[PDB]
Every structure is written in C-alpha cells, then in structure tokens.
Symmetry: C2
C-alpha cells in the first residue's frame, strides 16, 4: 500500500504553472498571475513549495499508516513566519499562548450554515474568542458586540441569520465584523482536534465521507488559529493537501481559499472539490498543449520564463523526478474523476461560463433553458466565486467570448447587478476587453432603459466607465 | 568633397528604425510596424534599402554636378521588380479617394498637358477585371478655361461618394512614355538651376517628382521608385534629410505647393526619429510602440552591404551644424497653421500640452482642417487625432478645455469610433464619462459613420 498516492498529481502538475497552487485565483487576472504575489513577499513562492514538498517527502516514505500529530502540524508552520529576532514572542514555529490574533470577514466569505457551525464550536466559547460587528484598530478590533458573550446555544440558528443579514447590509465585499481568536488552551484544543480527526477519518469508508472529515477538521484548525501568523498557508495551502494526497486526490488549486472560517463543512467540501477540479484541468490543458486560460488570465511566454528561472526548491525537484511505485496511476485518476462528478450537477450555467470554451458544447448547454435559469444568481453558501452572479457576469470575468455570445443570443439580462453592485458592463470595463464591452453595449443601447443602465453605480459609487477610464493605471490599496 | 551631403542624415538615422523610411506611417499601428509590410513580400525591406544606398553611393561619387537622367531612373527600378525597362503600350491604372486629393491638386492634374495629348484617362468610373469602365473621361474635349470650375466639381463628386471611398479612376498614358520621361528630366534640370532658396528648390523637386509619378512610366513600383527612392536624392543633394511618410500616395492629385508641406512634415518625421533615438527616448509615432523583440527581429533581418558602407562613411569633411540649422529653419514653417492638431500627433509632455491649449477658444479647440492639408489632418479635430495617436495627455487637456467629442470627421466618425477601433479601454472610458454627463448622450452614442456603423459596432469587432 502507499501512503500519499496523491504525490502522483503533484508530479504531473506542470512546473511552469506550479505557482497556481499557492497564488489565489482571484489575483491572477489583475496581478499577472504570480508576479504580484511575488513582489509583495519575494520567494515565498519557493518557500511555500519547499514547505509542501519537504513535508510530503518525510511522509510518503516513513511511519506505519499515517496518523496526524500536533508536532507535525507545528512542524509545518515553521514556514513561513518571520522566524527572525528578537523577543519576546515567539518561536518562529511555535504556538500562541496568550498572544491575540484577529482579522475581519466580509459577507462574501460567509454563509448562514457556516455561521451557525462557527458559533457551535464550543472551544470558541470556553477559550474566550470574540466575534461580532465592530471596528478595526491598530491594536485589535473594537467590538460593538461579541456574540460569544452569554451565548445561548438554543438561539444560534436565529442569530446566524441575523449576523449574515448584518454583514450583507454592510456590503458583500465589505468588512464590518471581526474575529479575535482564542487566548486560552490553544495547545489543548489543537490536540483535541487532532485526536478527533484521527478517530473519525478511520470510520469513513467512501471518498466523500473522508472529504467531509478532512474539511471539517481543517476548518477547526484554521478557526482555532494556533499561530501568530500564516494560519491560512500553514493549513489550507499545506496541511489540507496532505490528507488530500493521502486519499489519492490531487492538491487543491483555489480561487479563494479564505472561506475556512465562516463556511460550513458541507459547503467547504464543494469548495475543495471545485478547487481540486482546477488541478485536473490545469494538468489536462498542459498535457493537451492547450493554452491555460482559467480565471481570465493568459500567461505570456515572458512570464513563464521569468518563473522557471525563479523556481528554486530541492524537495520539489525530488518529487518531480521520482519513480512510479504504483499500481493505479490510472485509478488514482478515475477515482478523483468520479469524486468530482458531483460538481457538474449544480448551477451548470455558471460553471460553463468559467470552464467551457467550445462553442458547440456551450450552445447545447444553453438549449431549453429559461429566462430564470439564464439569469440565475447563485445564493449564499455556494463557493465564493458564484454568490450573487449571473452566468453573464462570470462569462465576462473569465473572458469567455463563446459563452457571452450564446447568452446574448438567449437574451440574457445584462443590466443585473451582482452583490457588489456591479453589472456585466463594470466587469467588461475592469477587464479591458474592448470586444466584450462592445457586444454588451450594442445590446444595452437597443433597449428602453439604455441611459439608466449605463449610469448604474456599484458599491464604490462607481459607474462602468469610471473603471474603464482607470484601466491600466495602477492600484491604490486600503 | 561632399555634395550630396544629405547622406549625413541617413547615417544618423537609427539602424533599428531604418524600415520607417519605407513602411508608410499609416500601417505602423495596425501591422506591428514593419512586420506586415515584410510579410506581403519577404526580403522587400532590405531590397528597398539596398536600392537607395547603392544608388546614392554612385551619385555622390562622380556627379559634379549631378543629373537625374533617365538612365538612373531605370537603374532605380532595375532594383525594384520581379524589371528595369519602360512601358510602351501596356496599360497601368489605379483609383483615388477624395482623402488623397485637393481642389488645387486636381486643377494642376488637369493642367498637365502631356496627359491630354498622351491619351491618359480620368473621371468617375468603376473597377474592371482588365481596366476601369469609365462613366466619363475629363481629358476628352477638355476646355482648359473651365478647369478651375471643373476641379471644384470633381472634388465635390469624390466627397459625395465618401472621403475614404474610391469613385474616380486614372488610366495612365499609353503613347510616348520615353519622350515624356525625357521631357520631365530636362524640365527638372532646367528649373532646379533657376531656384535660389530652399523653398523654391523644394517646389521644383516635388513638382517634378509628382510629374514622374503621374506619368506612370513603369509596369510596377512607380511609388517606391520615385517617392521612396528618387525623391530622397534631390532632398539629400540640397542637404536635407530623407523623408519618412505617414501617407505618401498623394503625389497624384495633390498640388506641388501642398506637396511641399507634405514633404516638410515627412522630413520633420526623420528629424524627430533621430532626436528621440539620440535622447534614448522610445518611439511612439503614429501609434507603434516597437517591442524589444521586434527590434531584435529587425536587427537580425537587416542585411544590406551598401547601407553598411554609409553607416561607417566619414562625414568629417562636412559641417553638420550648417546642415542641421538649414533644415531647422526650413521646417519652422510647420507649426503655424493648425498648431494643435500637430500637438495631438507629436506632443507627449503634459506641461507643454497644457501650455499650448491655454487661452484657446472653443472654435480653435474644435477646429476641423480643410482639403489640401496633408492627408492625416483633413476633416479632423484635435480630439480625433489625439485618440488615433494614443495621445492620452492631449485628450485629457482637450477634455479639460471642454472640447466637443460628438463632432464627426469626413468619414462620419467621432472620437468615440476611433477609440473603439484603437481598442484603448482608457481613452474610450474618458470619452464615455464625458458623453454621459451631457443631455444628448444617447443621440451621441448612436452616431453612425459612413459605413452606417456605430462606435460600438467597431468595438464589438475589435480583434477580428
Ligand atoms: Mg483585526
């Protein structure tokens, strides 16, 4: 038997695209893929790759059958925190004791069922964690109200609705609430979660059962937030991939990984599956010598040569150039294909806009669909990228010309705004695609309301042409 | 020992941009500079360069004086064909759109008496599979007393059909081409000796190069032979730089006077090319930002022995500054009539631009230039030209000065149509922000050009 049959997918993953399993897909379009992430903290790209591979290297060939252990976990977060001096806290790879870490969460990174689950985590209650609406400070947030104070667990379903309602009133992408992690017993809870995992994982028989257990526990970790820094990479970009590859699944290439706090375990399974699905299509497209176009980003040959020259990781080289113990580098593949087949099922018009490029397939998919299906906006709980969007919005942000054409043919509503206030037009302007902008405007002008539609403002009070006029000048943070 | 001395400006011309004196400036934006011209005839750039340099190496050498003889004219061609010889009876013809014509130019064309007696044809017609079937030929029973009134009507007729549309055709002379070629040669050498100032000399040079073009003595490559090669010889003989052109194919229906202005700005281009390269300033003329890969591709493709000899020729036997100040004063003619428009084409510095547009009135900022001005200006506002050049700085200041962005040029197109066609999201955005704060926004966005197309029709095609 092997231990990490997943390593197979890691080795198959095309080297010049390996940055994709560390840079969130949401940055690729606007930051020339990996370059923006690289410039904000150079070489973390390697460091992150070196961490995964070196950790996975001392697993697939040791132990008995694997059991998770806190020491491993810490053994992980030793990359990458500062690690530099001086005092008085903390060991650049050790655990928080009383140190307080906090961050905010916008409605678009949350779900009602997710909030319900969050409030239900008992260690947050007894550990002294804080969560609620408030204000962000230079030394912590200032809460207007902390829900973990005097929390009646009978009231959590009603409370979860209210919280979600409040977060939306503030804005889909706006940070209103805040979370301050536990300041008591992190070592205890870290061990509790580890034991829970190793207990439950052994009960699960199917791969879907196992996924549920993996994401449920990875969440608890993240929410637990045991380190001073880099809890997200340490768990979701690194740790999550170990149980995934232990089950013989590929590692995850995420659009937006930062939903392991206020999404529910069930909804996270979906998030991880579509992430996984993304590693599979990366590999397939590269195998078929097809240019990779995911998430509206087209890598230039100069960007690719800059990255492989920059690529530098001994443990990655060892995994790329290894033997194929086997057997089943093809069941491995058929196993994950059956596991991911649950995706196709729900809101396919949106997934089509993201992943489909063949005009014939697209035309077929949109046949027999009604006005409400072609105009459907996906609701809370779906993976972040879908919430509030029509297939049209997603066609524009992917650059899916074929899909946009068919949607226009099917007389889709291009005036509808997603929960950021943006219409298909705001996105076309932001993407700087002259053609898709033109197609949309041709349609908009042949309608009654053309001026009202062109003057639509989003959550920044901006019109589509505000963004258009801004295209190609540089960003402006916070 | 120099004359010709102009060979000084050819050497100064930056090697990796030397294609610019062969590829029309109108192609650069939409054909990645030189690459589109090269792909239609591979090797044609080096052949044109080899022709100019090889022929210029034989002239400065013995001619003292020099003489544009029909022998060198034939030798020029001999280096620009499948073949070196003259036409006898073979018909050669082409069409001309109003935008390549002027009223004064048409007057002059009808006045070329060799076109009347030689049997050349020109009037409204249609394009044939072996020749144009003309509806009228103005050279038949032409009263030369009526040519000023006829020239106005021909121009109006060419405009009714459309600024960029071809209604009128020209079939060249089929009798006595060898005779007329010799007549023009003798006329040139006679008249050039009469002229004293550089402006007088220019008038004579362009007038004769025009006549050489209009008489289409060769089967092929009359343009390359007479305007991209021959024209540069008398120019350099006078100590002027060779000419870089936006659109030069105006040596038929433009007048000699107006062609002087066309050549002056073509020369101005060579001066701006050299200056920008000397200052290490990248080049952004007419809309082509050459990529480093393109430059390397051209540098590797460059291959012309006679060019190499001129690039390493020693012009220590010559005063560059006399030469330089002479062409300086000659070109200081340019930025006077319609100054802005030229600003929109050439100016990139926001400070200079802001200064230039200070205390200009609504009629100056909205001014559309009339027929006879070099092709690129005709019918356009400064705003149109800012958009086609990608002159962001100029467009910004024009918007600040509340320029009218609804005004359409003689192709029916507004600043918006051009922004769509150029595919510039930013300039399109700036324009639309303005248009929507106006009462007439919908009427303006729906403006159709000569092709009945709306700005967004072009936008939706962008990337074809
Ligand atoms: Mg905070």
């Amino acid at each position: 038997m092997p231990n990490l049959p997943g390593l197979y997918f890691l080795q198959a993953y095309p080297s010049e695209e390996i940055w994709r399993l560390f840079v969130d897909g949401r940055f690729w379009s606007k930051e020339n893929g990996w370059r923006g992430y690289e410039s904000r903290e150079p070489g973390c790209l390697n460091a992150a790759l070196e961490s995964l591979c070196s950790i996975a290297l001392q697993v697939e060939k040791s132990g008995e059958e694997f059991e998770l252990s806190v020491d491993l976990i810490k053994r992980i977060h030793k990359k990458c925190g500062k690690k530099v001096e001086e005092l008085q806290e903390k060991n650049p790879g050790e655990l928080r004791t009383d140190e307080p870490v906090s961050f905010g969460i916008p409605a678009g990174r949350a779900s009602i069922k997710g909030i319900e689950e969050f409030l239900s985590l008992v260690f947050l209650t007894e550990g002294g964690a804080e969560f609620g609406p408030g204000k962000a400070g230079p030394f912590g947030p200032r809460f207007d109200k902390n829900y973990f104070k005097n929390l009646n667990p009978e009231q959590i379903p009603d409370l979860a609705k209210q919280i979600y309602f409040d977060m939306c009133k503030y804005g889909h992408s706006n940070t209103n609430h805040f979370y301050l992690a536990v300041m008591k017993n992190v070592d205890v809870y870290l061990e509790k979660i580890t034991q829970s995992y190793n207990k439950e994982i052994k009960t699960a028989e199917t791969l879907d059962e196992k996924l549920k257990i993996i994401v449920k526990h990875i969440r608890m970790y993240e929410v637990l937030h045991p380190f001073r820094d880099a809890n997200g990479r340490t768990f979701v970009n690194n740790l999550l991939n170990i149980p995934l590859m232990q089950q013989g699944l590929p590692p995850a290439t995420f659009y937006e990984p930062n939903v392991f706090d206020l999404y529910s375990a069930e909804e996270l399974v979906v998030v991880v599956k579509e992430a996984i699905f993304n590693t599979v299509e990366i590999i397939e497209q590269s195998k078929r010598k097809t240019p990779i176009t995911l998430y509206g980003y087209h890598s230039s040959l100069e960007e690719q040569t800059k990255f492989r020259d920059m690529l530098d990781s001994p443990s990655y080289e060892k995994i790329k150039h290894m033997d194929f113990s086997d057997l089943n580098p093809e069941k491995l593949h058929l196993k994950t294909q059956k596991c991911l087949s649950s995706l196709n099922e729900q809101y396919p018009l949106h997934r089509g806009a993201i992943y489909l490029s063949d005009p014939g397939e697209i035309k077929l998919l949109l046949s027999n669909r009604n006005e409400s299906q072609i105009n459907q906006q996906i609701e809370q709980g779906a993976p972040p990228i879908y919430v509030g969007k029509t297939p049209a919005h997603l066609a524009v942000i992917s650059g899916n010309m074929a899909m946009l054409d068919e949607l226009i043919a099917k007389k889709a509503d291009l005036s509808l705004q997603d929960y950021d206030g943006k219409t298909a037009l705001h996105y076309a302007a932001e993407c700087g695609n002259m053609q898709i902008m033109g197609k949309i405007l041709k349609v908009v002008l042949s309608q009654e309301d053309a001026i009202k539609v062109l003057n639509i403002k989003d959550n920044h009070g901006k019109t589509a042409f505000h963004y258009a006029a801004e295209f190609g000048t540089p960003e402006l943070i916070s």
